[PDB]
Swiss-Prot record, chain B:
This is DNA-directed RNA polymerase subunit beta. It comes from the Bacteria. Belongs to the RNA polymerase beta chain family. DNA-dependent RNA polymerase catalyzes the transcription of DNA into RNA using the four ribonucleoside triphosphates as substrates. The RNAP catalytic core consists of 2 alpha, 1 beta, 1 beta' and 1 omega subunit. When a sigma factor is associated with the core the holoenzyme is formed, which can initiate transcription. The chain holds residues 349 to 398 of 1342 of the full protein.
UniProtKB/Swiss-Prot annotation, chain C:
The RNAP catalytic core consists of 2 alpha, 1 beta, 1 beta' and 1 omega subunit. When a sigma factor is associated with the core the holoenzyme is formed, which can initiate transcription. DNA-dependent RNA polymerase catalyzes the transcription of DNA into RNA using the four ribonucleoside triphosphates as substrates. It comes from Escherichia coli O139:H28 (strain E24377A / ETEC). The chain holds residues 1244 to 1342 of 1342 of the full protein. This is DNA-directed RNA polymerase subunit beta. Belongs to the RNA polymerase beta chain family. Signal peptide: none annotated.
UniProtKB/Swiss-Prot annotation, chain D:
It catalyses: RNA(n) + a ribonucleoside 5'-triphosphate = RNA(n+1) + diphosphate. The keyword Transcription applies. Pfam families: RNA_pol_Rpb6. Belongs to the RNA polymerase subunit omega family. GO terms for cellular component: DNA-directed RNA polymerase complex. Keywords: DNA-directed RNA polymerase, Nucleotidyltransferase, Transcription, Transferase. This is DNA-directed RNA polymerase subunit omega. PANTHER family: DNA-DIRECTED RNA POLYMERASE SUBUNIT OMEGA. The RNAP catalytic core consists of 2 alpha, 1 beta, 1 beta' and 1 omega subunit. When a sigma factor is associated with the core the holoenzyme is formed, which can initiate transcription. SUPFAM superfamilies: RPB6/omega subunit-like. Its EC number is 2.7.7.6.
UniProtKB/Swiss-Prot annotation, chain E:
Sigma factors are initiation factors that promote the attachment of RNA polymerase to specific initiation sites and are then released. This sigma factor is the primary sigma factor during exponential growth. Preferentially transcribes genes associated with fast growth, such as ribosomal operons, other protein-synthesis related genes, rRNA- and tRNA-encoding genes and prfB. Interacts transiently with the RNA polymerase catalytic core formed by RpoA, RpoB, RpoC and RpoZ (2 alpha, 1 beta, 1 beta' and 1 omega subunit) to form the RNA polymerase holoenzyme that can initiate transcription. Identified in a complex containing RpoD, the RNA polymerase subunits RpoA, RpoB and RpoZ, CRP and DNA. Interacts with Rsd; this prevents interaction with the RNA polymerase catalytic core and with promoter DNA, and as a consequence, promotes transcription from promoters that require alternative sigma factors. The gene is rpoD. Belongs to the sigma-70 factor family. RpoD/SigA subfamily. It comes from the Bacteria. It is found in: Cytoplasm. Contains 4 domains, connected by flexible linkers. In the active conformation, the domains are in an extended conformation, each making extensive interactions with the RNA polymerase catalytic core. This is RNA polymerase sigma factor RpoD. It comes from Escherichia coli (strain K12). Signal peptide: none annotated.
């Protein structure tokens, strides 16, 4: 089959240097004049930056002169002024060129940090520039006389050398010289000679540089690039419409700066040509050449020499490099953002009536949004003659169109998004409900996922146009399909505030209330008792209930009994579906328990019942909370009666210590510490006073004299339930608030003795102000830090996607409870949950396998593990996965918004990064910067040192600034001797044996070490446990998984030790390497296989290396990436997410994973 | 010890090193260095603390 | 604010309000990642190709939206297509290989 | 409406391939080539396809089979027409 | 040194050239006169250079050209 010629759907992309002829290929004509437009008739002057002949017709399908105006005439080149009449769009396409008189250096290859022309010629930059400016002469192909090939000479020196040797010696200057150098260069010979020289001499200094350079050279050879091309003969001109002259209001014009630049390059160029034909003196033509160099440089990339300024305006004119780079840090117009059709936004409101799967959509918004659908549907049923008439109909807002809109809306989800999108729940799909009014209504249960308050936050809507988008939205981005955080299996649909105050007030009990002690047949007549006003909502009562347990095999058991409960719990029970026990509603139902209700419901009955349950819980929560008449008065906040006395005694303490300072019994600092301690203790006292009084002081009577229970006071119920408020803020309300701190970090020794219930005076408020401002500043900053972190994270992961199904390795990490110093800072059950066993696990006795090799451990398996005493389970992790270029689903875990095992093709790196990043706002060496330090691998300030090798050690030599430590292995050779500075207090025992990785000193340790000495599992364990320490200290739930994938991406590269295929010390992919030595172990060489050493790269460092250059050009420094890729002729195959997003095709993950796979296998095949 | 790191000797020398500091790369002149240095903090025109 | 199909920017063809008929909402990097976490490729492609940057795909889409056929024949986003010309304007040859 | 797609995800494992298959079928209905396999409630083709997945009468295997049959159904029609192209000789 | 900024590498490059004396100008101009007059005389010694001018003037009177396209005028 004939392969093809014209447009197919392309794969990969290539980048390289451009030949003069190659540049001429693109060019459809030479621009010979600086002229733009005629100045009266605004038509393009021919052969100028804007030209109809070279580039294209000014108006569609029309010749410039106007002779051929007919759409029939097309491939015709006009006889008057040749313009092929074609759409004006081709003026956005067709390029041009300029033939430069003298050769010119391309600023990108001159000034890139490792100057390409420089290190290709093994010549310094300053020399090359000194030669370019005609400030000295340089030799080329010196022959055998007196002189080196790359040697530089002066005027007098060149003259003398010329007098001595006329021929068989050669020297030039300027651009032509450098081009002569590059053209004369023979890379192959250099290769041979350098290999020889590499072999002969042994010095680290010599052969390091030697091998680096030979590698560079052979790379450039394999590229297909010939060095001369770094010097520009021909200069391409960008299409006119990409730098337009287009008119404005008031008859004014506006144009891109490139014109101003290009024009210059033309003028000077032309002038230079003139200066040749007039036979000008050298001093002149030289100046003109330099000027041409400067102009071209300014055109390509401005700012690397002089920074030319635009006409009449100080602001420096934007060059082509600045066009490519873009701005707002690193953003390429895909990255910063892109405007999108079929969308909208507005202020959002509540809408509690909504089911969890829908959202209120303003009528007008839905009208303008679905407009094309409405047009098509109106004439589909024939209510409109034509599309025009349809427009007139909906524009008139005729009454009939609203129903048609009701039709086009029904099954057709819309995407809702909020401003700070962090995790994937920042965008969710909903079913539109047509609503009068201009505000968007959003289901309350979802308000948690968006982090959306009602204080005027706005949300944006997007319409899923294509069918695939409708089904993606409904089956993926749908609200009901994500009930669980991807970070941890806990429900994100958890009831927020009003609702939980509702259920809390519902199931609670006071000591004596109407209907106390009586008995009822069932919840129905319990509610019937309540609504009629006979029985109180909360009273201790026995009622018959029928609960269910599915504990049979897939089968619901039933049992009935008399339960001792309250009226409220009885009424609430009506909602609880099926197989849930009555035990769950029989408690007080706080925000914590009310969550575990939904959770258990999900892990038992499945999705649908959990959804409908949650909805019901919300509705009843709101209803009953409204019934409750909960409120807040000024007398709802109770100050301790003993406050003033505490203040007084604590006030005696300070004057005591003060009297002791007056008599010198105590030093100033010790005094300060003392007084501060007494005030702090006082604060604690008042807090634990008001806490007791506020909490238990309801003292009430049942049938006897008295009894006392937990208070029914409003603010207490609020803080206790988990609705809103907390012991700290309550403490600030009634008891005194804190001891503030002055800006320098010190803490004022006279706290705020008053509170908010009382008044604060001038001083106390002024002092509170600093705390406030620092609070706002700090939080607003930590937002940015979080964002930056997520950025680095997704950059380092991204393309990691579940690819294979099972790599099939027994490998994994040993999972134990975290067990820190006290009892169990986190259990085993949470650590191993939803993960998969590496190998079968024992009972205390054996040949009895409870869990069989690799099996998803769900709640039942973990509970079965809990029944038995098993303290340890080895678990497969994403870090140990044998699969190359991705993760097998078998190694990942089940975790998702769904409880089933992770799907094939879901992109895990991104969700991992998001999962780590979203909570980062809540984080407070320690803290968020501690996390950033961790993922960046950074060696700490005052690190410890670990024993290089096991065996008995001792101290050796003396004090030079290092007192040497000599290690003595039992069997093996001694020679390892480490130089440890002796002014650092040691740990290691002079007479004791130390295992490798022991403490030879104290302080934190660099994970590079932990990886090298302790091993891979050790280092990943250190990272995960430390970062998890940071997060868990703040109360943040993040599964170890995500952190583990981040870690895997950190360790992607390693450095070889042995040999037999590739180079010695190269940092390289362990995917590539391991697949190569697994390939080498058999066939090939029998075994030549090479040993490597795993390396640890920080996230920002690991994100640096990416095969795809289009990807790198996005988030890295654009200029350098483009150059550095362009020299090697690097060929980007795409294959990743970022690059495919940039080029605008299907993501090689998720829904798209089917396509790419089908394409990936078709590639490199029959 | 500040003097020991001082490359200059006399007034003209210092003025040269100052003028070549402010407007470098171009050949210094006596009248130029004097004019500049007098024009910086000592001229009623180019300087005011008010 | 709401927009279906409005005016478009000249320099790069992108949605822009010229009538005080508002330019579309800006779909950023974070929103892209959000789409990437979900398995939705087509929502994202339609987001950055047909709904915005494709001077062909947008109209060809509109006609299908009215015809009752929900599909997309995406083509190449004009941003990247311009970037090609910008890169190639230098001494850099950037090509689209194979088939 | 279809509130949760979970049952369909049960019927075909991947859940991305669910979107794909349901899409393909939804187009078999939307572009008018075929008719629903189950009562349309006013559910748009989007949801009809999902109902078809849930009831287990539609997935990738079934579809590929049907289409592969239709190829021969047309190849049956054109049988004389294309053999009349013996002008190739 | 060289601060780049090509204005400078010009300014310093021309500044080497020494100003002309009032006599030197006349010397140089005289040199010019000598040089040119040599090529003029060398042209006068070429037969084809003459015959060409003849064949051209025969074309001028034949209306195949104009007097402006041959001579700018003679001495006179
Ligand atoms: Mg807010
Ligand atoms: Zn014409
Ligand atoms: Zn694996």
């Amino acid at each position: 089959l004939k392969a093809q010629t014209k447009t197919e759907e392309f794969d990969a992309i290539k980048i390289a240097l451009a030949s003069p002829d190659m540049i001429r290929s693109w060019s459809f004509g030479e621009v010979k004049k600086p002229e733009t437009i005629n100045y009266r008739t605004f038509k393009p002057e021919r052969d100028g930056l804007f030209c109809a002949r070279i580039f294209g017709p000014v108006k569609d399908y029309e010749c410039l002169c106007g002779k051929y105006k007919r759409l029939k005439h097309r491939g015709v080149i006009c006889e008057k002024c040749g313009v092929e009449v074609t759409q004006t769009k081709v003026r956005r396409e067709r390029m041009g060129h300029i033939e430069l008189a003298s050769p010119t250096a391309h600023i990108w290859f001159l000034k890139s940090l490792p100057s390409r022309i420089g290190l290709l010629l093994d010549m310094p930059l300053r020399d090359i520039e000194r030669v370019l400016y005609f400030e000295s002469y340089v030799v080329i192909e010196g022959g055998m006389t007196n002189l080196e090939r790359q040697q530089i000479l002066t005027e007098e020196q060149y003259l003398d050398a010329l007098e001595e040797f006329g021929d068989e010696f050669d020297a030039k200057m300027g651009a032509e010289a450098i081009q002569a150098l590059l053209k004369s260069m023979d890379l192959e010979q250099e290769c041979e000679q350098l290999r020889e020289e590499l072999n002969e001499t042994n010095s680290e200094t010599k052969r390091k540089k030697l091998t680096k350079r030979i590698k560079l050279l052979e790379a450039f050879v394999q590229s297909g690039n010939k060095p001369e091309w770094m010097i520009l003969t021909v200069l391409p001109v960008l299409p006119p419409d990409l730098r337009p002259l287009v008119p404005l209001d008031g008859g004014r014009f506006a144009t891109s700066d490139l014109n101003d630049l290009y024009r210059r390059v033309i003028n000077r160029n032309n002038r230079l040509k003139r200066l040749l034909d007039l036979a000008a003196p050298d001093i002149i033509v030289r100046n003109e050449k330099r000027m041409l160099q400067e102009a071209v440089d300014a055109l390509l990339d401005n700012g690397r020499r002089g920074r030319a300024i635009t006409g009449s305006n100080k602001r420096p004119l934007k060059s082509l490099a600045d066009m490519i780079k873009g701005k707002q840090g690193r953003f390429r117009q895909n990255l910063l953002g892109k405007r999108v059709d079929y969308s909208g936004r507005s202020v959002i409101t509540v809408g509690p009536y909504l089911r969890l799967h829908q959202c209120g959509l303003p009528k007008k918004m839905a009208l303008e949004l679905f407009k094309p659908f409405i047009y098509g549907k109106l004439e589909l049923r024939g209510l409109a003659t034509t599309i025009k008439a349809a427009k007139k109909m909906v524009e008139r807002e005729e009454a009939v169109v609203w129903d048609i809109l009701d039709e086009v809306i029904r099954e057709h989800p819309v995407l809702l998004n909020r401003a700070p999108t962090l995790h994937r729940l920042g965008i969710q799909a909903f079913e539109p409900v047509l609503i009068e009014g201009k505000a968007i209504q959003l289901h309350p249960l979802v308000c948690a996922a968006y982090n959306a308050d009602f204080d005027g936050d706005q949300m944006a809507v997007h319409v899923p146009l294509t069918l695939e988008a409708q089904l993606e939205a409904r089956a993926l981005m749908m609200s009901t399909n994500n009930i669980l955080s991807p970070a941890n299996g806990e429900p994100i649909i958890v009831p927020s505030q009003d609702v939980v105050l509702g259920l809390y007030y519902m199931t609670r009990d006071c000591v004596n209330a109407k209907g106390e002690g009586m008995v009822l047949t069932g919840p129905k007549e319990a509610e019937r008792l309540y609504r009629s006003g006979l029985a109180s909502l909360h009273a201790r009562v026995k009622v018959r209930i029928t609960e269910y347990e599915k504990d049979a095999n897939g089968e619901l058991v039933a049992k009935t009994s008399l339960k001792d409960t309250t009226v409220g719990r009885a009424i609430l029970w009506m909602i609880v579906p099926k197989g849930l026990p009555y035990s769950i509603v029989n408690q007080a139902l706080g925000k914590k328990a009310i969550s575990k209700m939904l959770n258990t419901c999900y892990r038992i009955l499945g999705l649908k019942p959990t959804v409908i349950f949650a909805d019901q819980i919300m509705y009843t929560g709101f209803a009953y909370a409204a019934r409750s008449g909960a409120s807040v008065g000024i007398d709802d906040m109770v100050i301790p009666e003993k406050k003033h006395e505490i203040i007084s005694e604590a006030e005696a303490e300070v004057a005591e210590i003060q009297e002791q300072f007056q008599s010198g019994l105590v030093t100033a600092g010790e005094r300060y510490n003392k007084v501060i301690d007494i005030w702090a203790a006082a604060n604690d006292r008042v807090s634990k006073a008001m806490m007791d009084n506020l909490q238990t002081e309801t003292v009430i009577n049942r049938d006897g004299q008295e009894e006392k229970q937990v208070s029914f006071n409003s603010i207490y119920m609020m803080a206790d339930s988990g609705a809103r408020g907390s012991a700290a803020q309550i403490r600030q309300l009634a008891g005194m608030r804190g001891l503030m701190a002055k800006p320098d970090g010190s803490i004022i020794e006279t706290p705020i003795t008053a509170n908010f219930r009382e008044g604060l005076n001038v001083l106390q408020y002024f002092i509170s102000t600093h705390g406030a401002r620092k609070g706002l500043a700090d939080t607003a900053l930590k937002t940015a830090n979080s964002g930056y972190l997520t950025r680095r994270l997704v950059d380092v992961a991204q393309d990691l996607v579940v690819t294979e199904d099972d790599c099939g390795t027994h490998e994994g990490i040993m999972m134990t409870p975290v067990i820190e110093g006290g009892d169990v800072k986190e259990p085993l059950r949470d650590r191993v949950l939803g993960r998969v066993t590496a190998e079968d696990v024992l009972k205390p006795g054996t040949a009895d396998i409870l869990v069989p090799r690799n099996t998803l451990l769900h709640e039942q398996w973990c509970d079965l593990l809990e029944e038995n005493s098993v303290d340890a389970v080895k678990v497969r992790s994403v870090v140990s996965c044998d699969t190359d270029f991705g993760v097998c689903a078998h190694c990942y875990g089940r975790d998702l918004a769904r409880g089933h095992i992770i799907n094939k093709g879901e992109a895990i790196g991104v969700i991992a990064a998001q999962s780590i990043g979203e909570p980062g706002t809540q984080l407070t060496t320690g803290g968020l910067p501690r996390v950033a330090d961790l993922f960046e691998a950074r060696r700490p300030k005052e690190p410890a040192i670990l024993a290089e090798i096991s065996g008995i050690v001792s101290f050796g030599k003396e004090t030079k600034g290092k007192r040497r430590l000599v290690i003595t292995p039992v069997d093996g050779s001694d020679p390892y001797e480490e130089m440890i500075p002796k002014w650092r207090q040691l740990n290691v025992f002079e007479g004791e044996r130390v295992e490798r990785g022991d403490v030879i000193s104290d302080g934190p340790e660099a994970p590079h070490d932990i990886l090298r000495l302790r091993g891979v599992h050790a280092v990943t364990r250190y990272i995960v446990n430390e970062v998890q320490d940071v997060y868990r200290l703040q109360g943040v739930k993040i599964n170890d998984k995500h952190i583990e994938v981040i870690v895997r991406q950190m360790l992607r590269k390693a450095t070889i030790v042995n040999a037999g295929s590739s180079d010695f010390l190269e940092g390289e992919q362990v995917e590539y390497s391991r697949v190569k030595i697994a390939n080498r172990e058999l066939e090939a060489n029998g075994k030549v296989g090479a040993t490597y050493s795993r390396d640890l790269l920080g996230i920002t460092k690991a994100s640096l290396a990416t095969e795809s250059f289009i990807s790198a050009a996005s988030f890295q420094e654009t200029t350098r990436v483009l150059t550095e890729a362009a020299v090697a002729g690097k060929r980007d195959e795409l294959r990743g997410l970022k690059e495919n997003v940039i080029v605008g095709r299907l993501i090689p993950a998720g829904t798209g994973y089917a396509y790419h796979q089908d394409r990936m296998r078709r590639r490199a095949a029959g | 010890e500040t003097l020991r790191v001082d490359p200059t000797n006399d007034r003209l020398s210092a003025l040269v090193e100052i003028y070549r500091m402010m407007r470098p790369g171009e050949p210094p002149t006596r009248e130029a260095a004097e004019s500049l240095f007098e024009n910086l903090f000592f001229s009623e025109d180019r300087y005011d603390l008010s | 604010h709401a927009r279906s199909t409005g005016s478009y920017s000249l320099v790069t063809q992108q949605p822009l309000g010229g009538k005080a008929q508002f330019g579309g909402q800006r779909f950023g990097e974070m929103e892209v990642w959000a789409l990437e976490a979900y398995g939705a490729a087509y929502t994202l492609q339609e987001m950055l190709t047909v709904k915005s940057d494709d001077v062909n795909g947008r109209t060809k889409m509109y006609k299908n939206i009215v015809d009752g056929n929900h599909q997309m024949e995406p083509g190449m986003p004009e941003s990247f297509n311009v970037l090609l010309k910008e890169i190639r304007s230098l001494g850099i040859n950037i090509e689209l290989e194979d088939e | 409406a279809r509130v949760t797609v979970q049952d369909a995800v049960e019927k075909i494992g991947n859940r991305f391939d669910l979107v794909l298959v349901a899409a393909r079928r939804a187009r078999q209905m939307q572009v008018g080539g075929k008719d629903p396999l189950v009562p349309e409630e006013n559910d748009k083709t989007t949801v009809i396809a999902l109902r078809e997945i849930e009831e287990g009468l539609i997935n990738n295997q079934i579809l590929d089979v049907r289409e592969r049959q239709e190829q021969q159904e047309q190849e049956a029609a054109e049988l004389q027409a294309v053999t009349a192209i013996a002008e190739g000789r | 040194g060289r601060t780049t900024d090509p204005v400078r590498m010009y300014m310093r490059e021309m500044g080497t050239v020494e100003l002309l004396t009032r006599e030197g100008e006349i010397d140089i101009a005289k040199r010019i006169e000598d040089g040119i007059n040599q090529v003029q005389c060398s042209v006068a010694e070429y037969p084809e250079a003459i015959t060409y001018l003849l064949e051209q003037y025969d074309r001028v009177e034949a209306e195949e050209a104009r007097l402006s396209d041959l001579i700018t005028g003679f001495v006179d």
